Design a protein around this ligand. Sequence first.
Ligand SMILES: NS(=O)(=O)c1ccc2ncsc2c1
Lengths: 179, 244
Amino acid sequence: AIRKKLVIVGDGACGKTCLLIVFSKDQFPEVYVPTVFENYVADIEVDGKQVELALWDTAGQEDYDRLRPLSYPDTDVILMCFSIDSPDSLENIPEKWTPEVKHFCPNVPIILVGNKKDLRNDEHTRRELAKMKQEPVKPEEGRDMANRIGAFGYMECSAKTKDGVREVFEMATRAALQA
Amino acid sequence: SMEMDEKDFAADSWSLAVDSSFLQQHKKEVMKQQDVIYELIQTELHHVRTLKIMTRLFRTGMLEELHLEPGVVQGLFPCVDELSDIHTRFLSQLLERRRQALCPGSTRNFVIHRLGDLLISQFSGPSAEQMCKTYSEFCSRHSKALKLYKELYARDKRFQQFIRKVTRPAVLKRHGVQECILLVTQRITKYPLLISRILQHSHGIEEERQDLTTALGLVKELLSNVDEGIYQLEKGARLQEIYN
Ligand SMILES: NS(=O)(=O)c1ccc2ncsc2c1
């Protein structure tokens, strides 16, 4: 068994904690969605390789510029997270999160993850985003951002419907097992 | 952790912990608020458990079996005793408040109405000053501990066998030396998110809403002071490297 470490970064409204919880839990938070995530060590078997994957969160650290980088040491893969129903969280990827992850973690694979993709066909999301001259993040805008920031790959998921969540974490395990 | 408390916090939520007949008598907003209060205590119980693993299992275990320099163990687990005292006292205060609120003839049914007052005490005055300085020292010595752990594991075979041995149980999956160290640093930043979500369902009592508003401001002031006083240490950082 090989031990690899994951870390999820991104603005709060991207849904990073939910993503970690819905993955780590065999169930679905039907009764209670926890406010916080401690840590989890997932047993993953990707492409025949069996890896132990420590999952970590940076939610709460967003305003503490010296406390936040203490999560980064020894990270093998980075999940760079943004919300599809939030174009503002995508714009902060190359301005805020990319400069910092590349500073502390040069050469560590980054996977751009577009969360809340189920909200791309939601009408409450279109109605409120029209009030700010905005509209849900288009697939090509996510792919082009992943390209522009030099991401290892670009993925999309929905932690509410569990759609594409197992794939993101199986791919992050491949990314962490590189070179 | 003690069996009594483990069984008291074994459920996923406060709604699953209390008896279904007791839950039925409460409103939506109350069940909501109590689920998040239950989480604040559940995670605090877990936090203290993490510091017990570090002190009794690793720190003490090393002192007794691995006969290495005493400053090595201090370098590995800095301020763990001080940290354990802060959180064991907070946990006791939180656990007593739950016990007081227990309905007569029941060990599981309760409703905590007052919490903001206990949080204002924790994050203000000497308790806040002792917490700020301890987390500043822990966090600034965090990296130096991760490097010292790796130096020892990848240079000493006795240290390697000890670690492999003490971490062998299934219950230590999330709790290796480094994961315990990150779990501790990440704890202080969980409080504002927990307190804001509790505050979101505490509008039924105006003095409770103001308590949780003040407590929120106090954790945030504390977090800013720890963050401002952090300067990473390096194992053998030369004097020239420090003053430049
Ligand atoms: N500069 S740092 O302490 O944040 C750090 C150290 C090692 C490492 N290895 C992989 S990601 C990473 C980050």
